[PDB]
Amino acid sequence: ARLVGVDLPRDKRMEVALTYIFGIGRTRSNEILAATGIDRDLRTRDLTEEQLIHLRDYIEANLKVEGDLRREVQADIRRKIEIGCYQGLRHRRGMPVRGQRTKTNARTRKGPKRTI
């Protein structure tokens, strides 16, 4: 059942089914399903089209979802780079930016081992 262009997977409870939208976690998925009137323990295959109109307008007026959230995150990284801040130089090289330890770790911002 398409909601924002995300294709909610069938046979999944609606408190969890909204979390596959980029920009909605477990906390937002409680308050999406409190404004409309949809109970949490509802399967997504029993999802009436009259219900799905009630959460294609509360999301597009109060949250930020695919496309125009993902174009903000890769624009906020883009802002830090050309101004030449410390986190911009640290975003170019792929080294971790929040003052992490880079001597024995930081295998997520880097790849696997190189073993010189």
Partner RNA sequence: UGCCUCCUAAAAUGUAACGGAGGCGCCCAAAGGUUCCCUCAACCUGGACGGCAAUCAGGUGGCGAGUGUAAAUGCACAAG
Partner RNA sequence: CUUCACACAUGCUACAAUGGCCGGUACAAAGGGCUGCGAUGCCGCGAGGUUAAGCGAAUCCUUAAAAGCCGGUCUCAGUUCGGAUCGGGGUCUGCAACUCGACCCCGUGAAGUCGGAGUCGCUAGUAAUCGCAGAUCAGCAACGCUGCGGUGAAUACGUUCC
CB of 5: closest distance to another protein in angstroms? 4
Return the closest-CA partner of residue 73 out of 20, 22, 8: 22
**Size of the residue set binding RNA (CB under 7 A):** 46
> Please, which of residues 46-75 interact with another protein by CB under 8 A?
49, 52-53, 56, 66-68
Examine residue 5 and tell whether it contacts another protein (CB under 8 A).
yes
For 80, the 3-state DSSP assignment is helix
CA dihedral of 52, 21, 14, 62, whole degrees rounded to 10: -60
**What is the maximum alpha-carbon separation in the chain?**
61
Examine residue 15 and tell whether it contacts RNA (CB under 7 A).
yes
**Cβ atoms within 10 Å, residue 66:** 13
For 21, the 3-state DSSP assignment is coil
Among 56, 71, 79, 92, binds RNA (CB under 7 A): 79
Residue closer to RNA (CB basis): 50 or 108:
108
Examine residue 98 and tell whether it contacts RNA (CB under 7 A).
yes
Element of type H or E holding 115: none
CB of 44: closest distance to another protein in angstroms? 14
Interface residues with another protein (CB under 8 A) are 2, 5, 7, 49, 52-53, 56, 66-68
